[PDB]
Amino acid sequence: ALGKLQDVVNHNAQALNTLVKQLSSKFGAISSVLNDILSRLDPPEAEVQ
Amino acid sequence: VYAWNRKRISNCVADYSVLYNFAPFFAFKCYGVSPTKLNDLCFTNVYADS
Amino acid sequence: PTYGVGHQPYRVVVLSFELLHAPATVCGPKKSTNLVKNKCVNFNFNGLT
C-alpha cells in the first residue's frame, strides 16, 4: 500500500550506497586508497594516480 | 636467463639505504613503488630473480 | 670485453613484491611506537596509514 514513499527512501539510501561504493573503485589506478598511493610513490607519479 | 634464479626473501627487516650507499647499478628502475619509500613500508611475497 | 656498450654482459636482478593483499613479513627499519587508546591518531600498521 505504501510502496511509493518507501520507494523514495529506497532510492535515496541506494544512491548514497552507490556513492559510498564508488570509493572502492580503482578508476584505472594502482590502488583505491590515497594513503597507499602517497606511502608508495614519488610525487611525479603519485600526482598521476 | 633461461634458468633464472629465484630466491624468496621473508621474515627479515630490510635496510635499503645501504643499497643506495654502495651501488654500481647503472639502471635502478622501479614500477609500482618509490625507491625512497621502501624503508617506510612493510612487504610480503618478496622475490629476487637473478 | 673488447665490444662496446650494448653488447656487454649485464646482470639483472628483479625484486618482486605484493601490495597489502596478505600478512607482511618483510618490513623497513622504522621503530615501533606504543599504542594509545580512545584518541584521534594517525597510525601506521604494517604500511597502512
Curated annotation (Swiss-Prot), chain B:
Subunit structure: Binds to host ACE2. RBD also interacts with the N-linked glycan on 'Asn-90' of ACE2. Cleavage of S generates a polybasic C-terminal sequence on S1 that binds to host Neuropilin-1 (NRP1) and Neuropilin-2 (NRP2) receptors. Interacts with host integrin alpha-5/beta-1 (ITGA5:ITGB1) and with ACE2 in complex with integrin alpha-5/beta-1 (ITGA5:ITGB1). May interact via cytoplasmic c-terminus with M protein. May interact (via N-terminus) with host bilirubin and biliverdin, thereby preventing antibody binding to the SARS-CoV-2 spike NTD via an allosteric mechanism.
Residues of the full protein shown: 350 to 399 of 1273
Role summary: Attaches the virion to the cell membrane by interacting with host receptor, initiating the infection. The major receptor is host ACE2. When S2/S2' has been cleaved, binding to the receptor triggers direct fusion at the cell membrane. When S2/S2' has not been cleaved, binding to the receptor results in internalization of the virus by endocytosis using host TFRC and GRM2 and leading to fusion of the virion membrane with the host endosomal membrane. Alternatively, may use NRP1/NRP2 and integrin as entry receptors.
Domain of life: Viruses
Protein name, as recorded: Spike protein S1
Effect of L19I: In strain: Omicron/XBB.1.5, Omicron/EG.5.1
